[PDB]
C-alpha cells in the first residue's frame, strides 16, 4: 500500500523541555537536517515496533500509526513535511527508523512549501494548497485503490483537507485515536458534486489559475464564494483547496451526469414496455466512467452507443454532462446511418438543437407518508 | 453569539510533567471536579485576556480562541467536555475564568457521554453520536445565524464531525491555527445530497433507528452487492450488530425532515413551462427553485391528496405537492385555466381525479434542472 502521511515533530519528543530547546537552530547546531535527523533517531532507535509501551510512549505518531496499519517492506510511505528545518529533521528521523525496522520499504519525504505552524496567512493561501496538490498528484500517480491517507502525525489543521481529498478520490483515511493505541477511520459522507450550481464559476476559476489572482468583485458579478476563494491583498482573490478541487473536477470530470433531450425522453418512455428501466440503468452506468467511455462517430462530437438489444444511443459529452440526443431501435438506427452517408447528419442535428432537442433534462426520473 | 466549543485539557498545562500526573485520580485527590477546577483555575487566574503573551502562552486553547473571536458578556459559551473527571475539571476551570473575565456571560458545560481519550470503541459508537446530536440540538435550539463552531480546544478526532455539521447546517466554524494567534475557518465544500442514491435506504434507516441495532445479516439483505457499496452510514456495535454512525444519523435526519426540497416537473408541467419561455424566460424556473430551497416560503387553495396552489407574485399558478424531499409540480397554468380548474374542484374531488391519472398523464416527474459548445469536444 501507499501511505500518505502528514508529519509533525513528535519524533523529537525526548528533547521537549530541554534547553537549548528543539527548534530550527537546534537542527543547525547538530549539523543540518540529515545530521540532526540521526541525533533525533538515536533517541528512539532501540524502541521496538512489537513493544506496546514503547509504541505509545517512545515512538513518533507517524511510526505508531504506521505500525498499527501493519506497515511492511512491500509498502511505500510518503511523509509530507513542513518546510521548516525541524519539521524536515523529524521526517528524516522517521524515515531512518522505518528503513531499519522494515528493510526494503520505500520511504519518500515531500517538503510542502508554505506548510508551517506559525503563519496562518501563508498556510491558508499557499501551504494548504500545496499540500492538497501534492497529495492529489500522489494519488493520481499510483495505482487505483492503493493509497491510504494517514493524518495522525501532525497538523490538526490538515485533517479536514485529508477528509475532503479522501471523499473526492475514494481514498480511505485512518488515524490513531487520541491516547489509545487504536486506529479509527475518518468519516466520509456520500455526497454528489454540486456541478450545476458551481458551473457558472468555471470561467472564474480558470481565470484565477491562468492569472494568479482576480478581483473579488468578479465573484459577485455567498457561502460558495467564501469557501472557494482566499483574499490575497489589494482586493484580489486566489483559490482555496476547495476551489482548487472544484476547478480540477470541472476541467477534468471524473463522473458525468446524464441528460435527455426532449426527443430522448419521448424515446425512453416508448421503450418502457419492452425494456423497462434497463436503458436508464445503462446510461447511468456509462456516465459513471467517462474514462471507459473515452464508437460510430458523427460530426460535432456526436457518437453512438449500443447497450448490448434493440436500443442505441446518440450521445455527446459537454463538460460533465452526458447528453443523450436520441434513443432508437435498430431500424431507425439504420435509417439515421443512411442519412449520415447522404448528408453531414451531425451538423443537421446541432442546427436543430434549440427547436427539437433543448432543453436537456437530467436523467433523474421519479415514477405512504403524511402530506405537506 | 453562541459559541459551540470542543474542550480539551490545555487549561491544566501547568500541571503537565508533574508526578502524580494530572488525570482523573488527581481530580479526586483535589476534592472532585468542582474543587479541582478551582486549583486548575488558580494557575492562570491572574492572566489577562488583553495580554498578548498570556493569550499565546498561558491561557487554554478554548480561552485563546474565544478571545480572538471577541467573546463578550452578551454571548453564550457551550463547553462540550469529555466525560472524564479531568476533562470536566478543565471545562469548569475555563468557565470560572470566562465568568470573571466577562461578568454576565452565559457559560454552560455539556458533558458528552462516551467522549474520552482512551477507548476508541466507546468513542466511535457513543461518543461521536452523542456529540453530534448535542451540537445539532444546540444549533436547532438557537436562532438562525447565531451559532459559531469552535473546535480549537480539543479532540483532533472530532474535527471531521464539526466539518460535516457545519456544512449541513450552514454554521461557520473557526479555530486558532497551530502555533499562531490567528483564526482560520474550517473548509466547507459545497455538495449535493445524493438523494437518489440514498432514498432507497429510507426504510432501512428508519428500521435501524427503531431498534437498538440490527444484525449484519439483515443489513446485507437490505443493501446491494457487497462489492458495490455506503458503509460510512453504519457503525458496528459489537456481537454482529450495526447501528447508524453520525453520518448515517445526519442522512436519516435529512430524509425524515428535509431542510430543502428539489423541484420536479410532471410531463405536463414541463410542456407548460416551455410555452412560457417566450413571455417569462426562466423567471418561473427561479421562483420554483427558490420556494423549494425554503420550506418556510412554501401556499393556498388546498386540494385533496396533498395538492395545493402557489402563485409566483404575474398570472401563472402552480399546482404542486410535496413527497419527501421532492416538490412535485403537476401543472403550471395561466389565470384562466386556473379558474377553470377551481371550477372542476367545486364540482368534484379534483385532487382525487388528478392522482388517479398520475401514471398516464403526469409521470415521470423530471428534476427541474434544464440545460439550454465553447470547449474542446470529449476525448
XYZ file of C-alpha atoms in Angstrom:
751
model
C 0.000 0.000 0.000
C 0.978 3.663 -0.348
C 0.623 5.527 2.941
C 0.222 9.281 2.503
C 1.230 10.629 5.911
C 1.034 14.059 7.448
C 4.108 14.612 9.606
C 4.741 16.557 12.818
C 7.563 16.825 15.349
C 6.673 14.060 17.821
C 9.831 12.197 16.732
C 11.734 14.802 18.767
C 9.690 14.382 21.950
C 12.708 13.372 24.062
C 14.004 16.926 23.567
C 10.832 18.719 24.676
C 11.532 20.668 27.871
C 15.312 20.565 27.451
C 17.402 23.689 26.829
C 18.614 24.504 24.191
C 15.095 23.769 23.022
C 14.355 21.711 19.939
C 13.804 24.137 17.050
C 15.408 25.075 13.737
C 18.557 26.429 15.414
C 18.879 23.070 17.171
C 18.947 21.349 13.775
C 21.789 23.600 12.614
C 23.832 23.114 15.798
C 23.578 19.361 15.270
C 24.826 19.590 11.705
C 21.816 20.260 9.447
C 18.683 18.309 8.589
C 20.304 14.974 7.768
C 22.836 15.026 10.620
C 20.236 16.283 13.103
C 17.821 13.542 11.991
C 20.335 10.931 13.146
C 20.554 12.571 16.579
C 16.742 12.561 16.802
C 16.562 8.963 15.541
C 19.128 7.879 18.136
C 16.713 8.839 20.928
C 14.273 6.071 19.944
C 16.267 3.717 17.715
C 16.138 0.881 20.258
C 12.354 1.038 20.667
C 10.725 -1.998 19.072
C 7.557 -1.984 16.982
C 6.353 -5.024 18.967
C 6.628 -3.249 22.355
C 3.230 -1.772 23.208
C 4.650 0.535 25.892
C 7.295 1.944 23.535
C 4.872 2.351 20.615
C 2.773 4.818 22.629
C 5.472 6.451 24.765
C 8.724 6.453 22.791
C 7.866 6.333 19.088
C 6.523 9.116 16.894
C 2.860 9.477 15.961
C 3.744 8.551 12.376
C 5.513 5.360 13.449
C 2.799 4.368 15.925
C 0.054 4.776 13.332
C 2.021 3.029 10.552
C 2.753 0.095 12.846
C -0.957 -0.197 13.613
C -1.576 -0.217 9.844
C 0.754 -3.218 9.507
C 3.398 -1.342 7.503
C 5.823 -3.762 5.831
C 8.745 -3.943 3.411
C 6.424 -4.005 0.363
C 4.790 -0.660 1.196
C 5.543 2.926 0.234
C 5.467 5.688 2.846
C 5.197 9.308 1.703
C 5.924 11.740 4.544
C 4.552 15.233 3.876
C 6.771 17.539 5.885
C 6.557 21.160 6.899
C 9.097 23.371 5.099
C 10.922 24.075 8.398
C 14.271 22.528 9.281
C 12.931 20.922 12.461
C 9.912 19.531 10.620
C 12.165 18.002 7.991
C 14.659 16.639 10.550
C 11.831 14.759 12.289
C 10.570 13.341 8.985
C 14.069 12.147 8.128
C 14.279 10.550 11.585
C 11.038 8.663 10.899
C 12.426 7.531 7.527
C 15.617 6.226 9.199
C 13.556 4.204 11.671
C 11.178 2.743 9.076
C 14.077 1.698 6.848
C 15.803 -0.055 9.762
C 12.578 -1.665 11.045
C 11.390 -2.848 7.598
C 14.381 -3.172 5.256
C 13.268 -2.642 1.671
C 10.434 -0.236 2.420
C 10.250 2.765 0.073
C 10.091 5.999 2.076
C 9.971 9.452 0.479
C 9.935 12.861 2.140
C 7.842 15.501 0.363
C 8.533 19.008 1.643
C 5.449 21.196 1.289
C 6.186 24.856 0.603
C 4.362 27.219 2.958
C 3.344 24.400 5.300
C 4.413 25.503 8.781
C 2.883 26.195 12.203
C 3.323 29.950 12.754
C 1.944 31.938 9.787
C -1.787 31.416 9.205
C -1.906 33.581 6.085
C 0.882 31.677 4.329
C -0.794 28.451 5.373
C -4.220 29.440 4.070
C -3.051 30.867 0.703
C -0.141 28.557 -0.155
C 0.726 25.849 2.361
C -2.587 24.013 2.410
C -2.976 24.427 -1.350
C 0.497 22.981 -1.976
C -0.359 20.131 0.395
C -3.621 19.402 -1.424
C -1.911 19.495 -4.852
C 0.951 17.243 -3.766
C -1.366 14.678 -2.176
C -3.687 14.616 -5.208
C -0.673 14.212 -7.516
C 0.489 11.217 -5.482
C -2.958 9.595 -5.574
C -3.104 10.067 -9.330
C 0.495 8.823 -9.793
C -0.092 5.486 -8.021
C -2.398 2.612 -8.871
C -6.112 2.753 -8.156
C -7.124 1.670 -4.658
C -3.507 1.620 -3.480
C -3.407 4.743 -1.273
C -4.256 5.219 2.421
C -4.374 8.695 3.971
C -2.786 8.849 7.433
C -3.272 12.242 9.107
C -2.064 11.057 12.557
C 1.307 12.673 12.785
C 0.786 16.425 12.792
C -1.304 19.425 11.793
C -4.787 19.202 13.228
C -5.416 21.943 10.669
C -4.812 19.486 7.800
C -7.385 16.883 8.972
C -10.374 18.449 7.096
C -8.392 18.632 3.843
C -7.480 14.946 4.103
C -11.203 14.195 4.648
C -12.197 16.143 1.529
C -9.476 14.631 -0.672
C -10.429 11.172 0.579
C -14.147 11.727 -0.073
C -13.459 13.038 -3.571
C -10.948 10.418 -4.748
C -12.396 7.455 -2.862
C -9.307 7.005 -0.663
C -9.702 5.815 2.947
C -8.236 7.787 5.838
C -7.359 6.428 9.273
C -5.556 7.704 12.356
C -4.684 6.786 15.924
C -7.471 7.835 18.240
C -6.210 10.270 20.907
C -4.344 8.469 23.700
C -5.400 4.990 22.633
C -3.305 2.659 20.539
C -6.256 2.081 18.220
C -6.898 3.282 14.688
C -10.255 4.730 13.687
C -11.409 5.697 10.178
C -12.245 9.271 9.395
C -15.928 9.716 8.500
C -16.823 10.008 4.829
C -20.204 11.230 3.870
C -21.552 10.098 0.480
C -22.378 13.248 -1.491
C -22.799 14.318 -5.100
C -20.585 17.016 -6.560
C -22.671 20.203 -6.874
C -21.892 20.612 -10.563
C -24.956 22.537 -11.785
C -24.637 25.229 -9.090
C -20.836 25.516 -9.378
C -20.577 25.501 -13.193
C -21.119 29.303 -13.569
C -17.860 29.700 -11.631
C -15.847 27.660 -14.151
C -14.509 30.678 -16.143
C -13.576 32.499 -12.910
C -11.707 29.512 -11.508
C -9.858 29.116 -14.786
C -9.086 32.857 -14.793
C -7.545 32.594 -11.330
C -5.495 29.620 -12.450
C -4.219 31.474 -15.525
C -3.813 34.944 -13.960
C -2.812 34.015 -10.346
C -5.491 36.235 -8.790
C -8.517 38.281 -9.875
C -10.617 40.979 -8.167
C -13.005 39.705 -5.527
C -15.669 41.851 -7.210
C -15.680 39.424 -10.148
C -17.008 36.757 -7.780
C -20.270 38.635 -7.166
C -20.725 39.650 -10.821
C -22.353 33.699 -0.884
C -21.150 30.706 1.124
C -19.690 29.232 -2.066
C -17.752 32.441 -2.675
C -16.190 32.357 0.781
C -15.282 28.662 0.761
C -13.742 28.520 -2.736
C -11.557 31.631 -2.559
C -8.914 33.353 -0.417
C -8.277 37.074 -0.061
C -4.643 37.749 -1.021
C -4.443 41.550 -0.878
C -5.264 44.632 -2.988
C -8.840 43.418 -3.458
C -7.777 40.179 -5.183
C -8.634 36.531 -4.576
C -6.984 33.202 -5.357
C -8.206 29.649 -4.769
C -8.663 27.749 -1.565
C -8.102 23.974 -1.664
C -11.879 23.565 -2.099
C -11.780 25.955 -5.063
C -8.841 24.007 -6.498
C -10.632 20.669 -6.122
C -13.736 22.092 -7.834
C -11.648 23.677 -10.607
C -9.914 20.342 -11.209
C -13.202 18.394 -11.369
C -14.758 20.893 -13.768
C -11.752 20.841 -16.113
C -11.297 17.052 -15.960
C -14.519 15.359 -14.854
C -14.275 12.009 -13.084
C -18.004 11.376 -13.426
C -20.697 12.555 -15.844
C -24.369 13.344 -15.266
C -26.733 12.043 -17.988
C -29.247 14.430 -19.566
C -32.021 13.526 -22.040
C -33.039 15.726 -24.951
C -36.753 16.407 -25.393
C -36.823 13.711 -28.066
C -34.823 11.209 -25.996
C -37.243 11.354 -23.052
C -40.052 10.547 -25.509
C -37.890 7.742 -26.922
C -37.183 6.351 -23.454
C -40.847 6.312 -22.406
C -41.785 4.290 -25.510
C -39.087 1.730 -24.593
C -40.605 1.214 -21.112
C -42.943 -1.524 -22.371
C -40.186 -3.589 -23.972
C -37.107 -2.802 -21.873
C -38.355 -1.477 -18.516
C -35.665 0.590 -16.787
C -32.751 -1.290 -18.359
C -31.961 1.729 -20.633
C -31.917 4.040 -17.605
C -29.521 1.758 -15.734
C -27.196 1.523 -18.727
C -26.936 5.289 -19.361
C -26.410 5.899 -15.636
C -23.732 3.177 -15.615
C -21.917 4.659 -18.624
C -21.970 8.150 -17.106
C -20.122 6.885 -14.020
C -16.974 6.020 -16.041
C -16.032 8.763 -18.532
C -12.572 7.200 -18.953
C -14.106 3.909 -20.098
C -16.463 5.952 -22.281
C -13.337 7.540 -23.790
C -17.903 4.152 -31.483
C -19.644 5.061 -34.733
C -18.844 8.780 -34.856
C -20.697 11.692 -36.396
C -19.584 15.317 -36.605
C -19.936 17.849 -33.743
C -18.779 15.310 -31.151
C -21.872 13.116 -31.607
C -21.403 9.344 -31.463
C -23.338 6.111 -30.999
C -23.504 3.746 -28.024
C -25.022 0.252 -28.073
C -26.172 -1.324 -24.806
C -25.832 -4.935 -25.970
C -30.564 -5.187 -27.520
C -32.642 -3.020 -29.818
C -31.700 0.279 -28.196
C -28.900 2.500 -29.488
C -27.976 5.913 -28.096
C -26.928 9.032 -29.998
C -24.836 10.947 -27.440
C -22.296 13.706 -26.911
C -20.345 14.930 -23.888
C -20.272 18.606 -22.915
C -18.089 19.014 -19.847
C -19.661 16.967 -17.060
C -22.944 16.386 -18.932
C -23.544 13.204 -20.935
C -26.130 14.400 -23.468
C -28.473 11.751 -24.872
C -29.872 13.200 -28.103
C -31.864 10.142 -29.257
C -32.584 6.576 -28.175
C -33.536 4.438 -31.163
C -34.221 0.872 -32.237
C -32.230 -0.886 -34.935
C -34.461 0.160 -37.846
C -34.278 3.885 -37.043
C -30.546 3.495 -36.337
C -30.061 2.107 -39.859
C -32.109 4.967 -41.303
C -30.017 7.526 -39.406
C -26.779 5.981 -40.621
C -28.176 6.270 -44.152
C -28.828 9.954 -43.535
C -25.163 10.334 -42.488
C -23.993 8.712 -45.697
C -26.043 11.220 -47.701
C -25.529 14.360 -45.574
C -23.449 15.650 -42.687
C -26.004 14.294 -40.232
C -24.282 15.681 -37.138
C -24.335 19.199 -38.496
C -28.065 18.895 -39.151
C -28.707 17.618 -35.592
C -26.995 20.563 -33.919
C -28.668 23.016 -36.311
C -31.947 21.803 -34.764
C -30.687 21.781 -31.166
C -32.860 24.656 -29.951
C -36.042 23.758 -31.848
C -36.013 19.967 -31.464
C -33.692 18.820 -28.669
C -33.374 21.509 -25.996
C -33.929 21.741 -23.101
C -31.941 18.719 -21.979
C -33.267 17.442 -18.649
C -31.387 15.485 -16.021
C -31.971 11.732 -16.118
C -33.499 11.508 -12.652
C -37.000 10.136 -13.163
C -39.498 9.796 -10.325
C -42.125 7.142 -11.094
C -47.213 6.427 2.081
C -46.112 9.404 4.203
C -48.053 12.340 5.695
C -48.814 15.180 3.309
C -47.009 18.522 3.463
C -23.245 34.751 19.550
C -23.476 31.140 20.730
C -20.009 29.572 20.712
C -20.108 25.789 20.493
C -16.659 24.835 21.783
C -14.957 21.453 21.878
C -12.832 21.284 25.010
C -9.548 19.678 25.955
C -7.190 19.734 28.926
C -4.906 22.656 27.993
C -6.303 24.592 30.986
C -4.228 22.276 33.185
C -0.984 22.623 31.165
C 0.833 23.996 34.207
C 0.444 20.559 35.837
C 1.896 18.648 32.870
C 5.055 16.676 33.574
C 4.379 16.513 37.316
C 4.150 13.295 39.330
C 1.434 12.403 40.384
C 0.379 13.281 36.844
C -2.712 15.298 36.007
C -5.516 12.782 35.442
C -8.818 11.597 36.934
C -7.144 10.449 40.163
C -5.587 13.919 40.504
C -9.085 15.443 40.327
C -10.309 13.042 43.019
C -7.332 13.792 45.247
C -8.053 17.526 44.931
C -11.664 17.144 46.059
C -13.639 16.301 42.887
C -14.462 18.168 39.691
C -15.675 21.440 41.218
C -12.895 21.764 43.803
C -10.210 20.608 41.395
C -11.400 23.153 38.823
C -10.517 25.937 41.272
C -6.990 24.556 41.680
C -6.593 24.405 37.897
C -8.097 27.885 37.527
C -5.726 29.316 40.149
C -2.736 28.531 37.900
C -3.858 31.156 35.345
C -6.377 33.308 37.258
C -4.047 36.322 37.044
C -3.522 36.073 33.274
C -5.380 38.781 31.365
C -7.455 38.455 28.189
C -5.801 41.547 26.662
C -2.254 40.311 27.447
C -0.833 39.048 24.141
C 1.887 36.906 25.721
C -0.612 35.333 28.130
C -3.037 34.546 25.286
C -0.351 32.763 23.266
C 1.458 31.008 26.144
C -0.547 30.817 29.385
C -4.267 30.552 28.620
C -6.166 27.490 27.420
C -6.890 26.890 23.736
C -10.586 27.488 24.454
C -9.883 30.868 26.067
C -7.341 31.892 23.420
C -9.734 31.098 20.568
C -12.716 32.779 22.276
C -10.607 35.873 22.931
C -9.683 36.097 19.249
C -13.368 35.715 18.372
C -14.207 38.711 20.564
C -16.214 36.880 23.232
C -18.230 39.348 25.329
C -20.714 39.444 28.206
C -23.738 39.139 25.887
C -22.563 35.815 24.410
C -23.264 32.189 25.266
C -20.407 29.688 25.504
C -21.221 25.966 25.400
C -18.249 23.885 26.548
C -18.526 20.336 25.188
C -16.491 18.283 27.650
C -15.205 14.752 27.807
C -16.974 12.659 30.441
C -13.696 12.120 32.333
C -13.127 13.925 35.626
C -10.018 15.698 34.313
C -11.801 16.843 31.174
C -14.686 18.224 33.229
C -12.409 19.905 35.761
C -10.721 21.747 32.901
C -14.043 22.844 31.401
C -15.160 24.159 34.779
C -11.819 25.995 35.112
C -12.468 27.675 31.755
C -15.999 28.549 32.908
C -14.617 30.064 36.141
C -12.270 32.213 34.085
C -14.751 33.393 31.462
C -17.223 34.383 34.179
C -14.583 36.504 35.926
C -13.294 37.986 32.646
C -16.760 38.786 31.217
C -19.242 39.046 34.104
C -22.712 38.266 32.795
C -21.547 35.784 30.160
C -23.673 32.630 29.967
C -21.381 29.601 30.121
C -22.617 26.012 30.346
C -20.694 22.732 30.392
C -22.132 19.951 28.245
C -20.709 16.606 29.367
C -20.718 14.259 26.375
C -21.205 10.628 27.405
C -18.658 8.357 25.740
C -16.312 11.208 24.854
C -12.895 10.370 26.330
C -9.334 9.802 25.169
C -8.591 6.131 25.828
C -11.386 3.869 24.456
C -11.744 4.107 20.678
C -14.713 1.747 20.585
C -16.794 3.810 23.019
C -15.770 6.973 21.166
C -16.702 5.737 17.698
C -20.078 4.403 18.835
C -21.498 6.528 21.655
C -19.098 9.476 21.944
C -19.311 10.822 18.396
C -23.085 10.262 18.164
C -23.723 11.970 21.491
C -21.504 14.872 20.431
C -23.187 15.150 17.017
C -26.687 15.107 18.500
C -25.809 17.586 21.268
C -24.272 20.035 18.784
C -27.188 19.646 16.356
C -29.688 20.173 19.176
C -27.987 23.414 20.239
C -27.875 24.649 16.639
C -31.590 23.928 16.285
C -32.420 25.435 19.698
C -30.947 28.849 18.792
C -31.975 31.285 16.086
C -30.624 31.196 12.559
C -27.145 32.645 12.148
C -26.347 32.694 15.876
C -24.011 29.717 16.321
C -20.262 29.529 15.717
C -18.475 26.183 15.923
C -15.138 26.366 17.762
C -13.163 23.097 17.563
C -9.873 24.600 18.840
C -9.751 23.263 22.349
C -9.567 19.543 21.968
C -10.171 16.292 20.115
C -8.476 16.252 16.729
C -10.808 13.272 16.158
C -13.938 15.447 16.436
C -12.880 17.979 13.774
C -14.410 15.912 10.912
C -17.813 15.839 12.628
C -17.718 19.586 13.220
C -16.960 19.987 9.489
C -19.942 17.870 8.446
C -22.300 19.569 10.912
C -21.107 22.989 9.775
C -21.553 22.003 6.118
C -25.032 20.548 6.583
C -26.492 23.285 8.813
C -24.507 26.150 7.260
C -22.876 27.142 10.561
C -19.408 28.749 10.468
C -16.504 27.051 12.173
C -13.272 28.800 13.147
C -10.191 27.774 15.100
C -6.766 29.034 16.149
C -4.258 27.889 13.530
C -1.487 25.707 15.062
C 1.037 27.834 16.954
C -0.199 31.152 15.555
C -2.577 33.597 17.199
C -4.886 33.839 14.187
C -8.290 32.346 13.424
C -8.920 30.377 10.246
C -12.223 28.899 9.022
C -12.724 25.199 8.596
C -13.082 24.341 4.898
C -16.628 23.876 3.611
C -17.126 22.034 0.323
C -20.459 22.817 -1.400
C -22.016 19.413 -2.063
C -25.340 17.953 -3.145
C -27.124 15.291 -1.136
C -27.011 12.014 -3.073
C -30.770 11.867 -2.593
C -31.500 9.499 -5.484
C -28.833 7.055 -4.290
C -29.817 7.387 -0.611
C -33.634 7.487 -0.850
C -33.864 3.690 -1.455
C -32.388 3.371 2.045
C -35.136 5.381 3.800
C -36.986 2.320 5.218
C -33.697 0.673 6.224
C -32.507 3.722 8.148
C -35.904 4.133 9.814
C -35.862 0.467 10.818
C -32.376 0.825 12.308
C -33.471 3.887 14.282
C -36.456 1.951 15.702
C -34.217 -0.816 17.138
C -31.113 -0.743 19.322
C -29.251 -2.196 16.303
C -29.917 -4.672 13.503
C -27.967 -7.852 12.666
C -25.365 -7.584 9.917
C -27.164 -10.382 8.064
C -30.289 -8.220 7.830
C -28.284 -5.168 6.757
C -26.722 -7.261 3.981
C -30.148 -8.402 2.739
C -31.368 -4.797 2.541
C -28.209 -3.440 0.873
C -26.872 -4.009 -2.667
C -23.914 -6.229 -3.533
C -21.084 -6.026 -1.007
C -18.512 -5.072 -3.666
C -20.777 -2.169 -4.790
C -21.374 -0.088 -1.650
C -22.458 3.364 1.839
C -20.511 1.656 4.600
C -19.852 5.019 6.255
C -23.542 5.303 7.245
C -23.219 2.358 9.618
C -21.224 1.501 12.741
C -20.593 -1.949 14.198
C -21.744 -2.013 17.801
C -20.498 -5.495 18.649
C -21.891 -9.020 18.553
C -22.589 -8.767 14.826
C -24.981 -5.794 15.164
C -24.977 -2.471 13.318
C -26.410 0.960 14.129
C -26.226 4.343 12.427
C -22.951 6.264 12.556
C -23.097 10.074 12.835
C -23.014 10.212 9.014
C -25.963 7.816 8.928
C -27.778 9.851 11.580
C -27.325 13.084 9.618
C -28.619 11.445 6.432
C -31.565 9.849 8.248
C -32.478 13.200 9.852
C -32.432 14.941 6.482
C -34.588 12.237 4.860
C -37.180 12.490 7.668
C -37.192 16.307 7.980
C -35.882 17.825 4.730
C -34.370 21.277 5.015
C -34.564 21.916 1.275
C -36.778 20.499 -1.473
C -35.833 19.611 -5.051
C -38.433 20.667 -7.651
C -39.613 18.118 -10.210
C -41.822 18.864 -13.221
C -44.516 16.482 -14.377
C -44.695 15.671 -18.077
C -47.472 18.241 -18.479
C -45.716 20.864 -16.346
C -42.562 20.860 -18.494
C -44.769 21.400 -21.548
C -46.428 24.247 -19.634
C -43.114 25.848 -18.699
C -41.754 25.748 -22.242
C -44.771 27.591 -23.643
C -43.972 30.369 -21.126
C -40.367 30.786 -22.294
C -41.382 33.448 -24.821
C -43.085 35.721 -22.279
C -41.375 34.784 -18.997
C -37.984 33.241 -19.803
C -36.645 31.439 -16.726
C -38.385 33.582 -14.107
C -40.789 30.675 -13.344
C -37.785 28.351 -13.002
C -36.214 30.708 -10.465
C -39.409 31.008 -8.415
C -39.950 27.244 -8.208
C -36.306 26.657 -7.272
C -36.443 29.459 -4.695
C -39.548 28.204 -2.883
C -38.108 24.667 -2.914
C -34.946 25.831 -1.127
C -37.121 27.331 1.649
C -39.991 25.275 3.119
C -40.930 28.424 5.055
C -41.506 30.322 1.798
C -43.659 27.405 0.595
C -49.465 28.015 -0.287
C -53.190 28.459 -0.873
C -56.311 26.777 -2.205
C -55.647 23.293 -0.886
C -56.998 20.379 -2.890
C -57.188 16.788 -1.699
C -54.280 14.289 -1.833
C -51.742 16.852 -0.609
C -52.111 19.054 -3.703
C -52.173 22.846 -3.396
C -51.564 26.011 -5.389
C -48.725 28.534 -5.473
C -48.605 31.994 -7.044
C -45.302 33.497 -8.166
C -46.322 37.094 -7.452
C -47.995 37.589 -12.561
C -50.843 35.352 -13.733
C -49.166 31.934 -13.619
C -50.163 29.458 -10.913
C -48.502 26.196 -9.894
C -50.352 23.032 -8.873
C -47.905 21.306 -6.532
C -47.477 18.665 -3.865
C -44.599 17.592 -1.622
C -43.371 13.999 -1.422
C -40.423 13.679 0.912
C -37.678 15.882 -0.487
C -39.381 16.391 -3.880
C -41.533 19.409 -4.694
C -43.783 17.943 -7.404
C -45.038 20.463 -9.965
C -48.134 18.925 -11.570
C -49.261 21.879 -13.736
C -48.273 25.469 -14.481
C -51.289 27.417 -15.730
C -52.475 30.915 -16.594
C -55.228 32.745 -14.708
C -57.995 31.494 -16.985
C -57.091 27.812 -16.779
C -56.624 28.189 -13.009
C -60.188 29.481 -12.690
C -61.492 26.574 -14.788
C -59.572 24.078 -12.617
C -61.051 25.559 -9.440
C -64.452 25.075 -11.076
C -63.701 21.382 -11.588
C -62.783 21.189 -7.884
C -66.123 22.705 -6.883
C -67.943 20.077 -8.924
C -65.767 17.098 -7.962
C -62.904 15.990 -5.745
C -60.458 17.317 -8.318
C -57.346 16.264 -6.390
C -58.528 12.653 -6.348
C -59.099 12.810 -10.094
C -55.585 14.220 -10.639
C -53.889 11.450 -8.665
C -55.890 8.776 -10.481
C -54.217 9.958 -13.725
C -50.701 10.043 -12.250
C -49.172 7.224 -14.303
C -50.927 8.090 -17.586
C -50.614 11.891 -17.695
C -48.020 13.171 -15.211
C -45.367 10.516 -14.556
C -42.458 10.514 -14.797
C -41.612 13.717 -12.969
C -38.202 15.049 -14.017
C -35.827 17.064 -11.896
C -36.058 20.791 -12.616
C -32.507 21.033 -13.931
C -32.760 22.212 -17.522
C -29.742 22.609 -19.787
C -30.342 25.026 -22.661
C -20.259 24.341 -27.146
C -17.231 26.528 -26.365
C -14.884 23.806 -25.075
C -12.964 21.003 -26.813
C -15.094 18.008 -27.675
C -14.953 14.998 -25.353
C -11.772 12.958 -25.839
